[PDB]
Design a protein around this ligand. Structure first.
Ligand SMILES: CC(=O)C[C@H](O)CC(=N)c1ccc(O)c(F)c1
Ligand SMILES: CC(=O)C[C@H](O)CC(=N)c1ccc(O)c(F)c1
Ligand SMILES: CC(=O)C[C@H](O)CC(=N)c1ccc(O)c(F)c1
Ligand SMILES: [Cl-]
Ligand SMILES: [Cl-]
Ligand SMILES: [Cl-]
Ligand SMILES: [Cl-]
Ligand SMILES: [Cl-]
Ligand SMILES: [Cl-]
Lengths: 114, 114, 114
């Protein structure tokens, strides 16, 4: 899976261990081995949410399977919890787009997963 | 909705009030309340369009509904208009990707919109 | 088409002409004229792949058609090859998301391709 967070919080406010924490927590949540999980955090962004620029985050989670109505509701709680505690972002200022991808449309290691 | 603009134009050329202009204009265009609109502007990017590094922009608008043939033409006119007027980017050097998302695939505040 | 590469490799490690090579090679691979290829390279990112912060990349290729099983394998070989040779990123630390988009959902020049 691939998890991306874009945020206006400054780089200094993103803990050094945040990417590893996200990796491990997403591995548990998706049931995928952590070696497969990629994480990308983009701080210092020029953003607004609801016309205001208090801390906020725009995220996406991409996976081959393990995406669906109930699962996504559960991922939102996991990810809002982490963003709230580690980045101090209110959960009502977080959007997460979920993508359930076909293996044929995910490239890796000179090929695709298909 | 969520609107993202990636451009090679320098930060200094992004007018103050641009995020608010995008928020309000998108509210009127989509008919969605401004409190749900998220906007993200990323200047100073390393990009090319047609091989040329003259000003360009790569955008994306994500929405639950309010996306379609007719609506997208209207959004493109509005958004290229703003990028031309405010950022001095030629409309033929702008791409906008439109995403009509299922409510179940959009996380917000510890749940999804489904 | 639109190709985006996000990487933790430093900017100084992206060779001069990389955006031109991507434009040219993607035009050849997709069969699309190079005038309509947009490329976006984002170095110096805060990223992890499998919990390691060694060089990695997360990419996407969006196209109206020219996306499918066999084609995507070919694009992945091409693109992972370039990331390995030019940016020194191991192919097993690259993900590429492929998106086959409807013309009605791609804005350009004040309109859409629909
Ligand atoms: C199950 C595995 O061995 C590898 C994973 O399936 C890769 C994966 N789920 C994956 C990686 C990047 C993506 O962007 C994505 F949508 C899915
Ligand atoms: C008025 C509402 O019910 C909330 C909005 O409809 C949410 C929305 N359309 C929305 C927000 C962020 C997204 O990334 C997205 F794809 C859709
Ligand atoms: C006449 C053409 O060949 C136009 C191209 O098909 C544009 C194209 N495939 C394209 C451009 C930007 C995009 O973001 C995208 F998803 C697709
Ligand atoms: Cl720390
Ligand atoms: Cl589910
Ligand atoms: Cl897919
Ligand atoms: Cl969706
Ligand atoms: Cl194919
Ligand atoms: Cl589409």
């Amino acid at each position: 899976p691939m998890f991306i967070v874009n945020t206006n919080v400054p780089r200094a406010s993103v803990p050094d261990g945040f990417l590893s924490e996200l990796t491990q927590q997403l591995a548990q949540a998706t049931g995928k081995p952590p070696q497969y999980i990629a994480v990308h955090v983009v701080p210092d962004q020029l953003m607004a949410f609801g016309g205001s620029s208090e801390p906020c985050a725009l995220c996406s989670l991409h996976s081959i399977g393990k995406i669906g109505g109930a699962q996504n509701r559960s991922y939102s709680k996991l990810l809002c919890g982490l963003l709230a505690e580690r980045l101090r972002i209110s959960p009502d200022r977080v959007y997460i787009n979920y993508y359930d991808m076909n293996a044929a449309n995910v490239g890796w290691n000179n090929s695709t997963f298909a």
